[PDB]
Short mmCIF file of C-alpha atoms in Angstrom, two decimals:
data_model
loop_
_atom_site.label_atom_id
_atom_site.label_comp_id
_atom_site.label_asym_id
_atom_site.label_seq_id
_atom_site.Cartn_x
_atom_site.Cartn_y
_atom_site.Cartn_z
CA UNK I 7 6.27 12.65 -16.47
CA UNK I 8 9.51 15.00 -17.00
CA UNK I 9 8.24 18.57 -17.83
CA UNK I 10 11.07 21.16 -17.54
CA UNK I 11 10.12 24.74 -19.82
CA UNK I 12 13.08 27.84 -20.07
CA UNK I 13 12.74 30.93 -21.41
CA UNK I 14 15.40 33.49 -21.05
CA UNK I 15 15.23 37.26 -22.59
CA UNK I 16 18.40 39.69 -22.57
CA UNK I 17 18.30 42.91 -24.56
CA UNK I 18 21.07 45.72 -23.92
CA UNK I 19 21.36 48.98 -24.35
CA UNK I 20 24.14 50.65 -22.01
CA UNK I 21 27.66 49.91 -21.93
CA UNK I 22 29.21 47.15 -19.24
CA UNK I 23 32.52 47.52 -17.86
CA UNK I 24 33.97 49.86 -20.22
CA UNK I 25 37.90 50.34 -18.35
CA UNK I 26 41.28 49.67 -18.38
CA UNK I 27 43.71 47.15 -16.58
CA UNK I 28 40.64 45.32 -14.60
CA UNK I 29 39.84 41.88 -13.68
CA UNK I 30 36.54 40.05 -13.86
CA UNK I 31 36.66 36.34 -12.31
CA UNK I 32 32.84 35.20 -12.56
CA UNK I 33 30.34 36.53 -14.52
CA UNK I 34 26.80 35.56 -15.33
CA UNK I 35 23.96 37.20 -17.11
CA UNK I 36 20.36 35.23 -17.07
CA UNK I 37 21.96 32.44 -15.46
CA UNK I 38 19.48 29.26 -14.37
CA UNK I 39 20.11 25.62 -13.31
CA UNK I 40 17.00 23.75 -12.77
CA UNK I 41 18.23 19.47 -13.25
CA UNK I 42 15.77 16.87 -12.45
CA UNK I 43 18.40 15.78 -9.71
CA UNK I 44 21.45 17.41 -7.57
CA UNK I 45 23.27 20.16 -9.07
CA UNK I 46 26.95 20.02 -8.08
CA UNK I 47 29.26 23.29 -8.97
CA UNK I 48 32.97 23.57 -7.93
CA UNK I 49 35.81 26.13 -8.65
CA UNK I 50 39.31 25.10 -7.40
CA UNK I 51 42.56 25.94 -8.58
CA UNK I 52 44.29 29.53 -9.35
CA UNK I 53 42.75 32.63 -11.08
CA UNK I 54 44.87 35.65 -11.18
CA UNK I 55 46.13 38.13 -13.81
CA UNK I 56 49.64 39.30 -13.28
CA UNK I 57 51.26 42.45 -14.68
CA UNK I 58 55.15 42.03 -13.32
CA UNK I 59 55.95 41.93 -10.31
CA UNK I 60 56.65 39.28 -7.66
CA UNK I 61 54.21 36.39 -6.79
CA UNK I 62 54.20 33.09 -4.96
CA UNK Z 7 7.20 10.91 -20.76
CA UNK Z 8 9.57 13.31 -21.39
CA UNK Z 9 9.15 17.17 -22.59
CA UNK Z 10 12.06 19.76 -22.42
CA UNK Z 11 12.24 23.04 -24.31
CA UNK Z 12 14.23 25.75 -24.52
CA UNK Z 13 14.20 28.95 -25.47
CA UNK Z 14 16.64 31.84 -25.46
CA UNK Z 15 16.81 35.10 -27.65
CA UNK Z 16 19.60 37.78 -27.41
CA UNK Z 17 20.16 41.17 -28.68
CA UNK Z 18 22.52 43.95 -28.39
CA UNK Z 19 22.98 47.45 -28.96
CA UNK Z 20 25.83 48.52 -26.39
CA UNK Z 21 28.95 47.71 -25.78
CA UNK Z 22 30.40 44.89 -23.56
CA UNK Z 23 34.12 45.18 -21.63
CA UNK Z 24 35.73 47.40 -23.73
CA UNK Z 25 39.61 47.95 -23.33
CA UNK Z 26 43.05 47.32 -23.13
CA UNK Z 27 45.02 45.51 -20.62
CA UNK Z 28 41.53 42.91 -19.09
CA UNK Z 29 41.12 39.25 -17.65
CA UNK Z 30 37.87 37.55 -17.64
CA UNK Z 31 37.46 34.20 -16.02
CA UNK Z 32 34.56 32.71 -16.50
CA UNK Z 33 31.60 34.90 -18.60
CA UNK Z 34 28.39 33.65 -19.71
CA UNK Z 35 24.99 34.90 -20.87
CA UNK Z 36 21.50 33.63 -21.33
CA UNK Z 37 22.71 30.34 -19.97
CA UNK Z 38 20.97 27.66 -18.61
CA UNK Z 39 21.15 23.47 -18.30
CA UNK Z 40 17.63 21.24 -17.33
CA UNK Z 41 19.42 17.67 -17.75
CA UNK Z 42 16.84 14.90 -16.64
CA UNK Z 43 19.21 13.80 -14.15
CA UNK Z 44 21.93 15.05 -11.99
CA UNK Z 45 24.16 17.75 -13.22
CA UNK Z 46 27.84 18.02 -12.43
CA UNK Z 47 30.01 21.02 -13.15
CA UNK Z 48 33.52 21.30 -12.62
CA UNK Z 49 36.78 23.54 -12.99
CA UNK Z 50 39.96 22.79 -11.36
CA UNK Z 51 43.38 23.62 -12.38
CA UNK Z 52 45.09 27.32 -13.40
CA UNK Z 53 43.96 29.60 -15.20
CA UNK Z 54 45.81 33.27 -15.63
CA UNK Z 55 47.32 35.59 -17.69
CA UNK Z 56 50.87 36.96 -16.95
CA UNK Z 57 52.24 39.88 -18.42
CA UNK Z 58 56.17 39.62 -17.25
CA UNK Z 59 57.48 39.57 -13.63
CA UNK Z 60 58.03 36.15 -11.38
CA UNK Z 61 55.18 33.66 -10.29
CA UNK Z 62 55.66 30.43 -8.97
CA UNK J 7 7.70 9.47 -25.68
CA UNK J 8 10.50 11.87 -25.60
CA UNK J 9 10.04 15.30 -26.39
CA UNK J 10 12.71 18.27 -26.69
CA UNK J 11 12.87 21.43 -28.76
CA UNK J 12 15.19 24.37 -28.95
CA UNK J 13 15.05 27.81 -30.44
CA UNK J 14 17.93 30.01 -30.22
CA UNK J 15 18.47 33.50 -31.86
CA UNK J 16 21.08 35.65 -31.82
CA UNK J 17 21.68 39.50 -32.87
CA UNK J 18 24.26 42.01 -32.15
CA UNK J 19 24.56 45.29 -32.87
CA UNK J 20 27.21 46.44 -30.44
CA UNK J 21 31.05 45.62 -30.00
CA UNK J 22 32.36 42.98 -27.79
CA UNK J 23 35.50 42.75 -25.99
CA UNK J 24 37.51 45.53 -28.14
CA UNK J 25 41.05 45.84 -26.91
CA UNK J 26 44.60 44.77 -26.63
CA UNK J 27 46.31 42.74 -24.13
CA UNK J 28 43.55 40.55 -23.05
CA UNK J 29 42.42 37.30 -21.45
CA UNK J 30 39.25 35.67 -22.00
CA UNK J 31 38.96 31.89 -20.37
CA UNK J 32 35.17 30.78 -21.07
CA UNK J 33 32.61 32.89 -22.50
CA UNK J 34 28.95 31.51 -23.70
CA UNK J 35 26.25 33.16 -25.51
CA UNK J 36 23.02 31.33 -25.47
CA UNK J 37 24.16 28.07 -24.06
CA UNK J 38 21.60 25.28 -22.65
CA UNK J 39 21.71 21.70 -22.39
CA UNK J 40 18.91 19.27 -21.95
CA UNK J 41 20.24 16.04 -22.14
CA UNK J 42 17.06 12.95 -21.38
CA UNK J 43 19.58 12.16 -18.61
CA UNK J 44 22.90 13.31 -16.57
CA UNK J 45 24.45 16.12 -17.51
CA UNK J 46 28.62 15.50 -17.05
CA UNK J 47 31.03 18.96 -17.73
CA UNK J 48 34.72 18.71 -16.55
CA UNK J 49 37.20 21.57 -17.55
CA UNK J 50 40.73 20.22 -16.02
CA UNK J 51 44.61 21.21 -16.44
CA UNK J 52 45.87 24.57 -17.53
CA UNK J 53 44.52 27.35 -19.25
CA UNK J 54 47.09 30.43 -19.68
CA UNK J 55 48.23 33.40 -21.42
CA UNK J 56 52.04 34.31 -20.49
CA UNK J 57 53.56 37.29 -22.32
CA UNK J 58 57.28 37.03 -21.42
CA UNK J 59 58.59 36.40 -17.65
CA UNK J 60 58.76 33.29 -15.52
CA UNK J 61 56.56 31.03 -14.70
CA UNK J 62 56.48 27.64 -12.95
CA UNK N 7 5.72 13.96 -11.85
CA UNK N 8 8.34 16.76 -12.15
CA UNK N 9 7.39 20.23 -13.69
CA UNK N 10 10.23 23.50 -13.51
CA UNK N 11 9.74 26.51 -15.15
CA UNK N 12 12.44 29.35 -15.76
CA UNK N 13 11.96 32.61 -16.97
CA UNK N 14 14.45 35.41 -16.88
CA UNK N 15 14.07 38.76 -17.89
CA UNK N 16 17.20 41.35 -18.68
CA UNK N 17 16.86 45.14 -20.10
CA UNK N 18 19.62 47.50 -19.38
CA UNK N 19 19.94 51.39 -20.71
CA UNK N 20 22.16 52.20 -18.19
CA UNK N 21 26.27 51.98 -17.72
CA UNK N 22 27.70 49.30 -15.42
CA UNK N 23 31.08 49.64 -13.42
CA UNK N 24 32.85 51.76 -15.96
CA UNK N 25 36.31 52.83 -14.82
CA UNK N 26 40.05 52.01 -14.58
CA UNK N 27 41.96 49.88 -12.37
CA UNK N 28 39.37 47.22 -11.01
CA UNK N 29 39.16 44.19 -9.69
CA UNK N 30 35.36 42.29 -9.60
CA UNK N 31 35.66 38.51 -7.30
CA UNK N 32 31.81 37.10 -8.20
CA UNK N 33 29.31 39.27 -10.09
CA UNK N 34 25.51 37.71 -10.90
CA UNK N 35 22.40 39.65 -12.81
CA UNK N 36 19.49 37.26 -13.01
CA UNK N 37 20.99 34.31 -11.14
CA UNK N 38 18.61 31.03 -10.39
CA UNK N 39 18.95 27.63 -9.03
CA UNK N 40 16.39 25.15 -8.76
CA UNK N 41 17.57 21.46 -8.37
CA UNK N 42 15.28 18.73 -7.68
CA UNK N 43 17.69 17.70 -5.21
CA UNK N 44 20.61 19.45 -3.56
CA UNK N 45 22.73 22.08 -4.62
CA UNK N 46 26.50 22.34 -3.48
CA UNK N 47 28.22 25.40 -4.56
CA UNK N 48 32.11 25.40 -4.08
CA UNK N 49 34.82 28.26 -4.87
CA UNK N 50 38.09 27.11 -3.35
CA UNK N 51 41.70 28.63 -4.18
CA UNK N 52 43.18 31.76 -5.39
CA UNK N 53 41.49 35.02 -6.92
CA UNK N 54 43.94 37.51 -7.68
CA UNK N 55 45.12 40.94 -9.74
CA UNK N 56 48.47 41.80 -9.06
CA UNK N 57 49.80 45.29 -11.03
CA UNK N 58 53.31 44.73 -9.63
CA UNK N 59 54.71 44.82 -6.17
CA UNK N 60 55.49 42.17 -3.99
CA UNK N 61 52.98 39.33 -2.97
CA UNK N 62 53.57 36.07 -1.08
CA UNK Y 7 5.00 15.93 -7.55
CA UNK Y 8 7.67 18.44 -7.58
CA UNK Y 9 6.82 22.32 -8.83
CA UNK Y 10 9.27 24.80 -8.85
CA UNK Y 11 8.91 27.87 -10.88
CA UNK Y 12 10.84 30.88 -11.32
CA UNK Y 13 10.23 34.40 -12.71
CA UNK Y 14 13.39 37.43 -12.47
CA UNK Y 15 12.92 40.67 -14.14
CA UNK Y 16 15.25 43.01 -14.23
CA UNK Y 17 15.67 46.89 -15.63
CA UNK Y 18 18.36 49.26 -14.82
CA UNK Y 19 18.22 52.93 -16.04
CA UNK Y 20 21.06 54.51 -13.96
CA UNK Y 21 23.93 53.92 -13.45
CA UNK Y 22 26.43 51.45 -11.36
CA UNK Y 23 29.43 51.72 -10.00
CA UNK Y 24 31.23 54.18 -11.75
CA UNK Y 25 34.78 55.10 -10.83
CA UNK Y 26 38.04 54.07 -10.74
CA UNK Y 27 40.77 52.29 -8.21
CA UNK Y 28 38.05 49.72 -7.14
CA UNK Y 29 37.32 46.62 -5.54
CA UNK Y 30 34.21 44.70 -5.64
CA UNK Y 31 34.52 40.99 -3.98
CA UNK Y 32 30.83 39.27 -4.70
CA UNK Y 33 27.78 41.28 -6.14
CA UNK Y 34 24.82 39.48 -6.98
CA UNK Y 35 21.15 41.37 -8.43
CA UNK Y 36 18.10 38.70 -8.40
CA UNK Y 37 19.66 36.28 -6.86
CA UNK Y 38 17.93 33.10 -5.56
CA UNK Y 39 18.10 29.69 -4.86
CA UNK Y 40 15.33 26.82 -4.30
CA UNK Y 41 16.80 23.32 -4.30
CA UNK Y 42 14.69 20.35 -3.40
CA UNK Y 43 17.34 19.63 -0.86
CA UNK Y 44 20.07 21.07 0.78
CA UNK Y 45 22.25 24.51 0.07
CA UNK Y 46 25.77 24.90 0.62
CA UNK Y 47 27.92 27.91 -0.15
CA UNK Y 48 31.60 27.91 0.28
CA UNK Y 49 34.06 30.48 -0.75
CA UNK Y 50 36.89 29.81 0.75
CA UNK Y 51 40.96 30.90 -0.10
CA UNK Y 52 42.25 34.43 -1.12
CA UNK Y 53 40.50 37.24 -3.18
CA UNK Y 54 42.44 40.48 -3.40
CA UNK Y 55 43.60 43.46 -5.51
CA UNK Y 56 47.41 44.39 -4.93
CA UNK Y 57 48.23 47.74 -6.43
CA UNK Y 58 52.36 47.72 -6.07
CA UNK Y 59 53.05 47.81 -2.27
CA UNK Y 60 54.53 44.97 0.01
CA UNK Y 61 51.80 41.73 0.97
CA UNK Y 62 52.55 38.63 2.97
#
């Protein structure tokens, strides 16, 4: 048959990313893909942070 | 036939993207997909934060 | 037959995300799916934050 | 038949990327993919910070 | 049949990246990938950090 087993842990004790005026697009702690078939993933488009200024 | 099983346990003592002025996309922890059959993620489009100034 | 089982826990003794000004798009603690088939996840159009200015 | 086992384990004590004025594209801590077929991984577009100034 | 298994452990004690005025396009700790098929990695389009200045 179909046997699919997860087991994910995450403790913390330190700090992450302790700042000011920063920018994170992809993040991913303990992250698992495991499907019985294809695994499609897309990202398309805009991401952006803006303070002023001129963009195009 | 069929047996899926998860298991996921988080703890925290510190601290996690601490301060002023931040973007975060796309953040995840202790995440995970076992589907049976395919598995289709997608993300299109805009996504942003604008603090003043000109974007086109 | 089928079989599926999930155990999630969850503690936090830290601070998350503490400040002003900020962006967060998709954020996930202990996610999972196990669906006896496909597994389907669209996230289309806009997703924004606009303090002030121009946009288009 | 079909049999996929995760496990992901995540201690931290330590500080990660702690400062002012950053930018961080793609960042992965305990990242996994195990499809019983393919796997297509896509990131098309923009990624951006912008803290003023002219951009086109 | 199909057996894929997968075991990530990870500790930190020290410290990572710690400053400020920083880029970082794609960082990736424990990272691996075992489809039953096929990989494909993309990243294609525009990933920068504009501190003031003139960019075309």
């Amino acid at each position: 048959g179909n046997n699919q087993q997860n087991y994910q842990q995450y403790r913390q004790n330190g700090n992450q990313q302790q700042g000011n005026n920063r920018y994170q697009g992809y993040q991913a702690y303990n992250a698992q893909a495991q499907p019985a078939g294809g695994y499609y993933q897309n990202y398309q488009g805009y991401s952006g942070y803006q303070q002023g200024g001129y963009q195009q």
